[PDB]
Design an enzyme around this catalytic site. Sequence first.
Site, mmCIF file in Angstrom:
data_model
loop_
_atom_site.group_PDB
_atom_site.id
_atom_site.type_symbol
_atom_site.label_atom_id
_atom_site.label_comp_id
_atom_site.label_asym_id
_atom_site.label_seq_id
_atom_site.Cartn_x
_atom_site.Cartn_y
_atom_site.Cartn_z
ATOM 1 N N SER A 1 -20.308 -75.378 45.749
ATOM 2 C CA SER A 1 -19.174 -74.073 45.617
ATOM 3 C C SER A 1 -18.210 -74.900 45.009
ATOM 4 C CB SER A 1 -18.467 -75.488 47.186
ATOM 5 O OG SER A 1 -17.801 -75.742 46.886
ATOM 6 N N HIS B 1 -12.814 -80.013 49.482
ATOM 7 C CA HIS B 1 -12.596 -80.013 50.164
ATOM 8 C C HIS B 1 -14.458 -81.370 49.727
ATOM 9 C CE1 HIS B 1 -17.287 -77.655 49.794
ATOM 10 N NE2 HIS B 1 -15.974 -77.054 48.390
ATOM 11 N N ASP C 1 -7.175 -74.086 47.603
ATOM 12 C CA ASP C 1 -7.548 -75.743 47.504
ATOM 13 C C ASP C 1 -6.893 -75.553 45.561
ATOM 14 O OD1 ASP C 1 -9.283 -76.041 49.067
ATOM 15 O OD2 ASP C 1 -11.027 -76.241 48.670
#
Lengths: 151, 151, 52
Positions: free
Chosen positions: A102, A28, A50
């Site tokens: 993140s 992302h 991911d």
Amino acid sequence: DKTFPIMLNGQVNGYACVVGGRVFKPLHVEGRIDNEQLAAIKLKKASIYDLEYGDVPQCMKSDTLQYTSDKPPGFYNWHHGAVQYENNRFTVPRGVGGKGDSGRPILDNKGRVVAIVLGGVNEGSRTALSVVTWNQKGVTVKDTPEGSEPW
Amino acid sequence: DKTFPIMLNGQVNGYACVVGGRVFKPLHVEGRIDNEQLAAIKLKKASIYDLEYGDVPQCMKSDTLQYTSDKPPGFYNWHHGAVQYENNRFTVPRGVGGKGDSGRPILDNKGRVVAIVLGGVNEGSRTALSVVTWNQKGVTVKDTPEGSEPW
Amino acid sequence: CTCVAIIMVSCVTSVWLLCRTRNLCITPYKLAPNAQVPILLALLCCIKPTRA
């Protein structure tokens, strides 16, 4: 430890962690890893777990050890504090939980990574983390709260 | 202050300055800025008025402020020394007048940039500088004395 | 076919010199955004309105 950042247009918007065998980078975020030994690694897409290819060379394999099940609620460390909850993470207070964060490992007292933070910017009184986790018998799941905007 | 130089195969040959709202770069040099945030900007070429593009966002913008009106012939600061001249540029001694000093800003006493040098290597006992400035009402002009080599 | 070549060459040359005149309208004044702008050079000769 070892967690190299990802930089797009010079500034930092995310971090890529290295677990034993495979390097995990959120997709992302976007950018390039600044390491020349890691930018040559092929990128393999997945779901919101991911994934990325574990083409880590044999000179510096096994950076960090992951943690399996039998996970107490306990007290678990964090880069800007501590989280004490197993089913989700602790509702950390405001301030911590900004942007460009993140990808941080969440480690135990022994240094075993148990989660990777993806989302949960604001969750009312205290923000609740949206992490990936290994379930009751070692399969990777993704746990999110309702209405959690990503980083 | 903030004035990032320009690299070309390691050696220093140019300087790039940052003003309020824009960035500058002289046209007499070729090379790449070592800053990654200052390398992805679309620097568009221009005439002798030296128009460039400050596409970088606000959060590092305006390191210094361009000079206002009411310019005296009084004291002006310089990286190698000082200059006291408004119509022309001062007869600075030797040492300054080498190679690769293009783009170094000329500032006032209050830290405000007045002129940006582009030429004038050595004009004998009295050394002149070919700079850009704002003439009377903020219109940006270019001043070049006679026999001004690109410096 | 010769007549449409003259009306195409002279169209893209007159707007080429007009684009140079449009470009040189601004670089005196985009270099100093704090300087004031006359009302003649804003909308009549050039295109740029008052901003910031």
